[PDB]
Write an enzyme that holds these catalytic residues in place. Sequence first.
Site, mmCIF file in Angstrom:
data_model
loop_
_atom_site.group_PDB
_atom_site.id
_atom_site.type_symbol
_atom_site.label_atom_id
_atom_site.label_comp_id
_atom_site.label_asym_id
_atom_site.label_seq_id
_atom_site.Cartn_x
_atom_site.Cartn_y
_atom_site.Cartn_z
ATOM 1 N N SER A 63 0.798 -1.229 0.000
ATOM 2 C CA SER A 63 0.000 0.000 0.000
ATOM 3 C C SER A 63 0.830 1.279 0.000
ATOM 4 C CB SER A 63 -0.939 0.021 1.204
ATOM 5 O OG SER A 63 -1.968 -0.917 1.022
ATOM 6 N N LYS A 66 0.315 3.619 -2.861
ATOM 7 C CA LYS A 66 -0.692 4.674 -2.883
ATOM 8 C C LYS A 66 -0.074 6.054 -2.755
ATOM 9 C CE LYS A 66 -4.367 1.809 -0.710
ATOM 10 N NZ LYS A 66 -3.683 0.476 -0.738
ATOM 11 N N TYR A 149 -11.036 2.676 4.460
ATOM 12 C CA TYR A 149 -9.810 2.445 3.714
ATOM 13 C C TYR A 149 -10.066 1.448 2.588
ATOM 14 C CZ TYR A 149 -4.837 1.414 2.950
ATOM 15 O OH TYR A 149 -3.584 1.233 2.400
ATOM 16 N N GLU A 271 -0.609 9.534 5.574
ATOM 17 C CA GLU A 271 -1.270 9.778 6.849
ATOM 18 C C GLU A 271 -0.428 10.783 7.619
ATOM 19 O OE1 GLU A 271 -1.364 5.852 8.407
ATOM 20 O OE2 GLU A 271 -2.941 5.177 7.031
ATOM 21 N N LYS A 311 3.269 5.837 6.289
ATOM 22 C CA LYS A 311 2.371 4.915 5.612
ATOM 23 C C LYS A 311 2.962 3.521 5.733
ATOM 24 C CE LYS A 311 -1.190 3.857 2.902
ATOM 25 N NZ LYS A 311 -1.475 2.645 3.698
ATOM 26 N N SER A 314 1.694 -3.523 2.753
ATOM 27 C CA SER A 314 1.891 -4.961 2.768
ATOM 28 C C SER A 314 1.413 -5.574 1.463
ATOM 29 C CB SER A 314 1.133 -5.630 3.928
ATOM 30 O OG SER A 314 1.619 -5.206 5.187
#
Length: 357
Positions: A63, A66, A149, A271, A311, A314
Amino acid sequence: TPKDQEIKKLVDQNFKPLLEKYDVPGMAVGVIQNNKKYEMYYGLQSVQDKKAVNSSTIFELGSVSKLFTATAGGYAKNKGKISFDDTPGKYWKELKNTPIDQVNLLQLATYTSGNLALQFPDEVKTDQQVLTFFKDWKPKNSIGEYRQYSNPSIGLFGKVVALSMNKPFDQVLEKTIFPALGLKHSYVNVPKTQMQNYAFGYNQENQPIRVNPGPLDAPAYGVKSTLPDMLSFIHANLNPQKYPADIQRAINETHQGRYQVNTMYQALGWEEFSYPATLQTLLDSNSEQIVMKPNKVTAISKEPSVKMYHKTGSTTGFGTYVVFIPKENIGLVMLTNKRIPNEERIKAAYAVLNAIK
Ligand SMILES: *[B]([O])([O])[C]([C]N1[C]=C(C([O])=O)N=N1)[N]C(=O)[C]SC1=NN=C([N])S1
């Protein structure tokens, strides 16, 4: 004790024990402090080949992909190719006048469509099937009010960004975004000349595995990179002022918090948190409540000027964690070819960053 040996001791104290604890075959931990990079590699990129982890080893980012999708979207926005107020049907014209066309691009990027789950069905295997999914999509919760999410949410965002640039998503990153940042070892599709450097991932039984994203999953978890490239990526996020206007503004977009969920501020991809932040603040962002369940968003009450960002990422066979703190001009990258608990990544990183210097 020289700084290189000081950082190595700290990483040995906090990350190295995770190898034996979780039978991790290989790991790469990088720290960048005041534009100096420190690289520490452990174990094996391929157990069966007895190939050691080194600076050329390519890992699956999960992820953390992203973050590149968010950067690409910030780039397209600042070039005037999209507005975050647009809706998907403007660019994927087949979606015009469908319910999903009531959701805007920012809401897709920050997971607030109100009815998109974490995973995309494995039964959706073709691009047509992806289009049919979003034509049939119907809302559930008030659009823009609940964070859930979601891979398909930012995946659709990524698809729209690529359309706005008249290029496939993989080419947006490999031909535009990665070069803009000097990332020479980062890939959506690892070429044949690089496979010798591509780590095996290892599942919870330590069986080797590599990711095979679906038609919608590359912007959500399809990027692979090395530790030096991720330290360069951290470096760009630490000093976006260096870059040409569109890339600089793009990075800054990914730093702008859009709403809060408790102590977490949802930026574009990243984040965001007030700095200093407690360990539990960072751990909460990866709790079951925040990751797996819907949470009502709220207006940002405390808007920190001194921030940090992170962030986790996985895949079945890999774990990633990236974190940086502009006011401290420091960041850290962890890559493993075995998934270990998010909490252990965050705790070890926290211990190292707070003891450095
Ligand atoms: B992302 O990493 O957040 C995203 C969701 N996710 C979180 C975790 C966790 O907390 O350990 N696991 N997944 N990552 C993915 O969806 C990729 S998992 C896959 N690996 N191979 C596939 N074919 S799907």
